Ligand SMILES: *C(=O)[C@@H](NC(=O)/C(=N/O)c1nsc(N)n1)[C@@H]1NC(C(=O)O)=C(CC2=CCN([C@@H]3CCNC3)C2=O)CS1
């Protein structure tokens with residue numbers, strides 16, 4: 001009884017346009033039984049056919065399967081296992097010296113700094129943490145049980161075959177012991193160059209099947225020349241034949257890359273998982289997006305063949321329809337490619353609705369994210385991340401150059417350089433001035449009269465720390481006489497400060513409406529901003545659960561009131577808590593749809609072989625936000641309409657056919673993006689700081705030793721005070737006593753963090769004038785972004801659009817995408 005693999009199902013748009021599909025290639029297959037067949041001859045024709053075959057392909061310039069885990073880089077023998085380990089570490093700036101356990105938790109500490117995982121995620125069973133990494137699209141090739149790398153277990157087990165119980169480490173030596181193993185029996189009168197072409201084919205065939213099975217593939221795509229060449233020379237090359245094997249293709253390439261996902265090799269760290277699930281070794285599996293989400297559905301139903309006699313025919317995978325409109329997704333992808341392009345070296349944003357001039361460097365931004373949802377039912381109509389990818393690079397499965405060289409980037413700033421990262425579900429950001437409608441919604445529900453106005457000072461002093469409108473921080477801060485509508489309209493932080501705190505702050509604290517942070521954070525929770533969006537079981541979503549009330553207490557003690565200055569920040573978007581575009585989308589959508597919390601969906605329907613369908617996304621929860629008076633939202637949209645026509649977004653929308661509600665979020669630079677190596681950065685610019693390098697190293701090294709001496713002593717003094725405890729168990733004391741004899745040598749960590757902390761210290765001593773800014777002068781700018789959130793047509797809404805350009809500074813950058821995606825939707 002032999003398994004047949006079903007044709008993989010198709011992924012289509014809401015209207016039936018193909019996004020993921022199949023296409024047939026011509027493959028070379030070798031039957032390991034037939035080539036190793038022996039009878040009267042002393043030796044199998046296996047080795048000769050392997051050589052013949054290859055030499056044929058290398059003549060036709062044809063790419064072949066090479067998984068043989070010893071390669072020669074310019075006459076030097078090396079393990080591929082050994083190479084993949086260090087390639088992984090350098091992939092995300094991990095120190096080579098770092099072991100399996102410290103290489104894993106290092107990846108964790110990065111993603112935790114990037115907001116993808118939380119601090120409570122680290123204090124967590126390591127398999128549940130590998131699950132969280134795995135769920136977000138991270139696959140560290142690390143077995144958490146024995147704290148070792150797959151490549152090592154894989155090397156030991158690969159050497160175990162050919163009965164090499166030697167374990168003596170030598171790539172040059174190992175190459176031989178296998179070459180003349182009882183199992184291979186390769187003739188010695190052949191050079192290790194042509195003798196290695198042999199092993200590629202034999203070692204492959206050996207690995208895939210131990211129990212007799214069906215053929216193995218040695219070329220996945222081969223041209224007309226090498227087809228007819230291998231049919232006519234069939235009797236010469238017994239075992240070698242031409243089959244057809246289907247492959248994954250995405251005709252629109254990079255379109256909806258992140259929602260769609262990719263198929264590729266089964267991830268090394270759970271091959272046993274997939275083999276008990278009934279998978280072959282030579283098998284492609286969805287590893288991201290809907291491809292993985294619906295792996296079981298799209299994989300279809302295996303049909304056996306008897307052991308030719310064809311018994312049970314397979315059943316093709318249900319066709320899965322997304323909620324994405326291709327037409328709109330196209331505009332959304334093209335939009336964001338364009339803003340990043342035109343923003344670099346300057347240009348014009350070309351728009352159906354009026355092209356705009358743009359000059360360079362106002363952002364210096366590499367990334368972008370945008371989402372568009374149906375506000376009634378939470379169906380996602382378009383979802384674009386930049387950087388993105390071609391799912392096709394993976395169909396065949398390149399796993400060295402295209403994968404390594406371009407699929408990650410600088411690991412000390414991954415949000416702006418991870419093409420596999422869906423910034424829309426997985427990238428959290430400080431919501432800027434788009435939070436304001438949450439603050440205003442809280443104030444309204446706690447009595448606020450929208451028409452109440454203030455003579456805007458444009459700045460609030462709180463002991464020579466000044467919280468001011470941007471219009472103040474750049475001149476005289478005044479929005480003159482200012483009610484809620486003008487506050488939302490021109491984005492007055494002073495108005496929001498006053499309503500968020502429930503008191504008139506420049507002149508004491510009174511107001512008479514009773515509003516605090518807890519009430520704002522309440523209205524955060526009500527708009528589902530501490531909640532997963534609905535996409536998490538369909539695509540990669542960063543979990544949105546925010547720290548609990550009792551979980552925040554327990555880390556404080558091992559107070560809980562809100563400062564005025566903090567409340568001020570929280571009111572206007574600045575805050576501990578950061579949120580993803582898809583999260584905001586639900587929040588703005590709730591304004592647009594009259595106070596309903598829609599659960600987002602990307603998978604619409606599946607359609608079986610018998611052309612019947614089912615609606616996957618009709619379980620989705622719509623839920624009446626428990627507002628005191630939902631008519632309060634109509635004052636938000638009254639505000640957000642003025643933003644479009646007269647406000648912060650008139651540049652884009654003022655001369656736009658459709659009534660658009662909108663709010664802009666924008667934040668300026670606040671520091672610098674760290675390097676992958678501080679220490680070397682400081683060495684590279686030692687001259688530029690007017691400091692001798694040798695001297696600075698010799699001093700930094702001195703300053704360290706002096707901190708150690710200091711730590712060492714204060715250690716000795718603690719052990720000795722501890723030893724004066726009258727009643728101390730003898731084992732306890734035998735430990736402390738044995739430290740003082742051989743130990744009392746405290747050492748610093750030897751990190752980039754530590755060794756570079758001390759070098760910067762040495763620099764400032766030998767240049768007593770230089771500033772941190774001047775030292776950090778060469779680094780990229782951190783802490784800037786622009787949000788545009790909008791919904792339309794404002795007076796009877798249908799669609800919400802959220803757009804973010806991180807490291808961007810001009811709200812033009814976010815507005816114009818939003819404006820295209822809304823324009824397109826309404827059929828203009
Ligand atoms: C809302 O987002 C408000 N922003 C801020 O308070 C911040 N200033 O730094 C902030 N919040 S969180 C963080 N890290 N920083 C006000 N609204 C906005 C808006 O809605 O657009 C304005 C900013 C403004 C517009 C144009 N800007 C750049 C300089 C001029 N050309 C580009 C710009 O910063 C006012 S702040």
Ligand SMILES: [Zn+2]
Nearest residue numbers: 456469479492
């Ligand atoms: Zn103001």
